[PDB]
Amino acid sequence: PDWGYDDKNGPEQWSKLYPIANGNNQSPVDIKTSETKHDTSLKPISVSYNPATAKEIINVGHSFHVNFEDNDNRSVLKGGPFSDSYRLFQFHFHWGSTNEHGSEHTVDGVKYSAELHVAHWNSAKYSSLAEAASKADGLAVIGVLMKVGEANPKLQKVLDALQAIKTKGKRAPFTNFDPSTLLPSSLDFWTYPGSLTHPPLYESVTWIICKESISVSSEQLAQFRSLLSNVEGDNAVPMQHNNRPTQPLKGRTVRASF
Template sequence: MRSIFRSIDYQEFVANSVMQASFNWGKLSPDYRLCQTGTQQSPIALSLGNGLSLNHVPKFNYNGSVAGNFANWGYGPAFTVAHNGDWTSHPSFTYDNETLYLKGWHIHAPADHSVGGDRSKAEMHFVHVDAEGHEGAVLAFRLDPGNFNNTFFDQLPPMIGFDEMQTQEPVDLDLSLALESVLHFNEFWTYQGSLTSPPCHEGIRWFVARQIMFTGVEQMQAILGASTYSARAEQEVWQHRINE
């Protein structure tokens, strides 16, 4: 996972295009130390051998259209929910009696997480924060091309490319259409992990849908055309507590 709403330092990091050197992030800055030394770093490889989670089942409060800005985060398409200073007014989900609020989403290509050794063409991350705005959980949607257009991506304007990175296009999205595409996470893996880009903060609860979110061929071509490589190298499983 990454946040598209970070500091100038992070924007400089993006501009330097060091995503592909993720094995060495911890040496780039003292602030990125966890990238090298953390015990719950993301992403990790998943498989049906891990089983599927029966715990931490998410319950969603995603109703109606949500206003925000569509942009390119420097590696691909992204959306920021319009913020009025009150995170609790955002779409939310609850697990284990904890409620977290959507900050926005962004796409990595290829996918961060592999499942059974297969890495999807892209992965969309719905980043959620607590009431104070601290990142706490990510819903991960693996994206692959299918035979029909996806109604969620049908809502988007034309993809914003790298030459238009300063562009932010206001748009209203029905985010529940994404949840419908993966059956509202009725089957999922979950684990305690981290951001998948510097500063690699840990304590992030990941939910990775088992169902693939299929797009149309042209939709996937548009996503990939607006994206560049942004998958972090998979991390060794250590203290991640998969499905626990």
């Protein structure tokens, strides 16, 4: 692809090929808690996932993705700022080259060591991800900040699966998994209108950022970094990082559910 995370094709150069990188609705952002506004219309988040929708784990070169069956509404996100249910599509992570900064979002300028994204599309209004993905109301992503510390045993199915998808394009079945198990105990959240965090950078995402973090150990993060961006047979190139810097708020308000 024409983009990545290296100095030659990374975030600071994505605007040349994707000019919306310099848009007014870009993600991630720093959440300044003193500036958030409470919206009394927000409802709690409700996640209702069916573990039989887990389908496949895929090495996509710059990251890896756990896909869910995309056929019906068996797994949905509801509540929060939404009127419509959104259909679970995938989850994935971002991480950094150091434990010091691997998240995408930051809170009061604090950088976490990784971030979980649980992505959904608006199957009430639209009929495919392809149709929804460029629409302002098309996508919803739950972000969870991951604080380095004790090993998180909830990650073990995912981490154990990585040995079968070492290089770019490899994939393997990944079944019987409810990714709400990866979320924090409480689903208190912030929300703002933003974008996918890598190309094509569409401004189509309602972000739901959990207030509570989850843990991850330094060795678990090293397992992400040990994934390889090259194809099989080519000299091994580790996926050392895949987190975008925070982007200007440009007048948006971050709403708080608490």
